[PDB]
Copies of this chain bind each other. A is one copy, B any other.
Amino acid sequence: HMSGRDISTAVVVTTISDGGFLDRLAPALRDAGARLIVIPDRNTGPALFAACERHRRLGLDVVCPSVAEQQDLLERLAVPDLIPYHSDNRRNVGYLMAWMEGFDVIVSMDDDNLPTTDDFVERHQVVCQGPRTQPVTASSDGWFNNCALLEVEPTEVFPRGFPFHARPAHAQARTSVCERPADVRINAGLWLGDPDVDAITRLAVRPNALAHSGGSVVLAEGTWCPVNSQNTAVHRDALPAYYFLRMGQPVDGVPMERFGDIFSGYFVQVCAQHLGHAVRFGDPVVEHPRNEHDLLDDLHKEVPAVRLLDDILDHLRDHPLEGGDYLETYESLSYALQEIAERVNGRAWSPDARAFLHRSAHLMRSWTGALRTVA
């Protein structure tokens, strides 16, 4: 008479579209009874609110808090300046809302990611499995390429946020699997169509993801892979470390963008491994008919971040973190970044580059303080 199993899932999507994406996203979420938290912005038209109510009458537990309601909640948490407007950083509101409402699983998605299977929510519930002995995947160079789990034309690619200095030698890395205890708390689902690559790779080969052929893997301690926020489930205990980093900080006078989830993906990952938890890559797989972007503009935004990421990732392996839970571990991580900001050296490490990590660390602790205020 095994009963009592009931995992709650909330899907977080921020968007400025008219809401037409709900026609293909609602069926998977409606069949599973999950909640969808749509976060609009000041540049979001009134057609999105009309689409949420239309799908709410069809059985979808969808909410769409207006910017006034969002700002009131942030005001009451003493963080009115934390989350800016006209930015997809406002998905942090949905993360916080789902965390306050006690959901077990928080699935971050974008408005151009459509589930391909009916068990989309169920597959993301893997972050609630708990610790068990299971096949974990280790890599001799400390990196795993989740795009090697996909059939990609015209050539092999690496995901967005993968360090560039490790790519040429990655072909000689030794991949091994063995039975070990692991506790999956983050599940990064893969994507067909336009894979999550950086603008450099997209401008070079225009990749196309044909099929998910590699299955799913759980990464052992010491093996990393970037985690995005377009098809990623985070267990509610790990959510405090999943704050979407604020963009716009200049590197050599060039404002960075498009890497908010590259940092959050690595940050929640180094926090999970310090607490004995793991990151999973594989199913559920979505289609990514990506919104229309100017690739040269995407390149101009990503370069300031890619100029620093390899150094930051290298120094993060040197810093030991402290903390008993994800709140304390994330705060310890924020102070680790401030020490890294002054020790790292290179041509790209101008005074505004070093100060980027200092303001990021403050906003990280402003985010955890808001969660502590909610208690």
Contacts and interface: CB of A to CB of B under 8 A. Distances in A.
A200 B204 CA distance: 6
A215 interface: no
A210 B241 CA distance: 47
Nearest to A84: B351
Interface in A224-265: 248-250, 252-255
B352 A250 contact: yes
Interface string A61-104: 00000000000000000000110000000000000000000000
Contacts of A348: 296, 300
Main secondary structure of the interface of A (DSSP, over half): helix
Interface string A271-307: 0000000000000000000000011110110010011
A338 B348 CA distance: 24
A320 interface: no
A124 interface: no
Interface residues of A, number: 50
List the 5 closest pairs (A to B, CB-CB), nearest first: A204-B204, A355-B355, A155-B155, A355-B359, A358-B358
Given A200-B203, A205-B205, A252-B300, 20 more contacts: A154-B155, A155-B155, A164-B203, A164-B296, A167-B206, A200-B200, A200-B299, A201-B204, A204-B204, A204-B205, A249-B355, A250-B351, A299-B306, A300-B348, A303-B303, A342-B362, A354-B359, A355-B358, A358-B361, A359-B359
12 contacts: A82-B342, A164-B295, A164-B296, A200-B203, A200-B204, A204-B204, A249-B352, A252-B254, A296-B310, A342-B366, A352-B355, A355-B356
